[PDB]
Each structure stands twice: as structure tokens, then as C-alpha cells.
Amino acid sequence: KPVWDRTHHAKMATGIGDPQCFKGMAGKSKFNVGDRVRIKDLPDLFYTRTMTYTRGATGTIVRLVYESPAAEDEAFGNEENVEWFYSIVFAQKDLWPEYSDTFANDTLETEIPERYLEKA
């Protein structure tokens, strides 16, 4: 029967934290603060944390937040690959067709790993 390593995450993260324990593991980021990026509509079978409401929308990267395995991998116990995560601001008008022009400036900010992002 398989054996699950119950000490691995505590060994790696104790006194460092998560996602600090992944820092440096993603290498060079593909994007920079201020880049405009469109969210790719990648297959979402079984798990994703990139909300459907964002797919195909364009936004601006405002921060490179941390490096981490993507949740699509961490939630199935796969943490060998690490990527950059970005905080992206979208105009609410670009998400919801009905949004009022009177509320011209309203935005939504959320986090997306690099795999979902293409240059706009």
C-alpha cells in the first residue's frame, strides 16, 4: 500500500512560511508590473482557482505577489513546479456588460498564476 510523507511540508516551511518557502523557485518572471495581460481560458476540468468570470478579460498587473505551485497542482499533491503569481486589476466594465458608465472607475483585483496570462 502507498505511504504518504507526513513530514515534508513542515520540514520545508517551518520558520519560513508558505509561500515564502517557494521563493526563488519560479525563476525569471514572464511579466512585469504595469503589463496588460488577457486571461487565457485554460481547461478547468476537476479544479481551478482562476474564476470563470475572469476568462478572456484583460487587466493590468499591479504586483508580483509571491512564487508558489499553482493551486491546480498543489491540490493534487504536486508541488515540484513553482510559478510566479500576479495581482491583476480589471475594470468592472470589462467583466460585466451591464455595469453602469456612472460607476466609471470601479475595479476588481485578484490573483492569477503565470500560466493563465498572455500579453494583451
Partner: protein
């Protein structure tokens, strides 16, 4: 008369301990830690920031470092010494300004900055808030009794990965010469979520219906 959930909780907990996955002492330690938590540290962070421009800069740039100053070390405060498994170690502090006002949700579940803020409210976990705030935030905020000018940018922050957020509201009028303590007192849990703004004289969250539990903590 125990419910099905009470039966299955006891079963799960006894099995986990029997199989050496965690101990009864572990479980007591965690519940003891959770009982420590609450919104005061986060209110203190905002008061300190309103009084010290350099510390407000640190809050906006590095919320994890800033949290240390109010005794919440996101790595070493929790019993794991690696941050709590569910809230991680990347606090960000969102600074409101006269042209920007934030409010926070987790549309995917209920992610919330427990280490610095304490328990998430019931309604924050509700599918209803999780559906509506992202798409009609002015409508939802008006239900909580908050309206802003139409030209003010309302930004909804959706906590869908490892970051957790607190809102640093603008300091309200009528607080000239106030001490850190008087300032922190008006920064309620709701102000830190962004569904309310601090007001002098108001020191508790707006009263709302409380649904009672069959058998309470």
C-alpha cells in the same frame, strides 16, 4: 439528542488520534490559539498607520512585516510555526484614499485574514455575498449602509489564492488630536472587511440578526 454532525465529528476526531495523525493535545492547542484571535491587532495596525507615515508605507508595501508591529507574526504566531495551513503568510493591506475604497470577499470560499482579524462573519461565507459583491458591489455595500461618490473607484478584492487582505480606511473627520487608542477603537471588523467606514462614536459593528446555534462554543 446529538446530531449527525456531532456523531461524525467525534468519530473523525477519535480515529485521527487513534491513528496517530494528530494528538488530543494538538487539537486543544489549536482551539486555544483560535480563541486568542480577534480584530484588535488589525485595528491597531490601521491606527498606527494613520499616525506614522513611514509605517503606513510599510503596511501598503509589506503587510507581513507590518503585522509584526501589532504582535501578529504570520509565520511564528500560529502553533505550526509555518503560518496557519489555511491562511498562509502573505497579508496585504489595501489603502483607501479619497478616490479609492476597497472591499474584500473570497468568491471561491471564505478565505479571510484570521491571524490578524479573527473569525470570518457568517454572511461573508454565504453563497449570496460570494455571488453578488464582485458584480454589484455598490448595491451590496448600500445594504450594509455604505455609499460612495460615483467617481470614487470602488475596488473589490477577491482573495482567490494565498493572499489575505485587510482594508485600511481613510481616517475620518472629527478625530483631530486623537490618540492611537481612540483611533483604533473606531476601526471595527466591518471597517477592516470594507463594508463599513470608521466613524467617531461608533465602536462596534452595526447590529444585525444573529442566527442561534443548536449547541454553542
Amino acid at each position: 439528542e446529538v446530531s449527525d454532525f456531532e456523531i461524525l465529528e467525534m468519530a473523525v476526531r477519535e480515529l485521527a488520534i487513534e491513528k496517530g495523525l494528530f494528538s488530543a493535545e494538538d487539537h486543544r492547542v489549536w482551539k486555544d490559539y483560535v480563541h486568542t484571535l480577534g480584530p484588535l491587532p488589525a485595528a491597531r495596525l490601521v491606527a498606527k498607520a494613520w499616525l506614522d507615515p513611514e509605517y503606513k508605507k510599510l503596511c501598503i508595501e509589506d503587510g507581513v512585516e507590518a503585522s509584526k508591529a501589532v504582535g501578529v507574526n504570520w509565520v511564528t504566531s500560529p502553533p505550526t510555526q509555518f503560518g496557519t495551513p489555511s491562511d498562509y503568510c502573505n497579508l496585504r493591506v489595501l489603502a483607501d484614499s479619497p478616490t479609492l475604497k476597497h472591499v474584500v470577499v473570497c468568491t471561491l470560499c471564505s478565505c479571510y485574514p484570521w491571524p490578524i482579524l479573527g473569525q470570518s462573519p457568517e454572511w461573508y461565507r454565504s453563497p449570496n455575498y460570494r455571488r453578488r459583491l464582485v458584480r454589484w458591489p455598490r448595491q451590496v455595500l448600500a445594504e450594509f449602509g455604505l455609499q460612495l461618490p460615483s467617481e470614487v473607484q470602488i475596488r473589490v478584492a477577491d482573495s482567490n489564492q494565498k493572499t489575505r487582505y485587510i482594508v485600511m480606511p481613510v481616517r475620518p473627520e472629527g478625530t483631530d488630536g486623537w490618540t492611537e487608542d481612540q483611533l483604533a477603537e473606531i476601526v471595527t471588523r466591518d471597517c477592516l472587511i470594507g463594508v463599513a467606514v470608521p466613524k467617531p462614536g461608533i465602536t462596534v459593528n452595526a447590529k444585525r440578526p444573529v442566527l442561534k446555534a443548536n449547541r454553542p462554543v
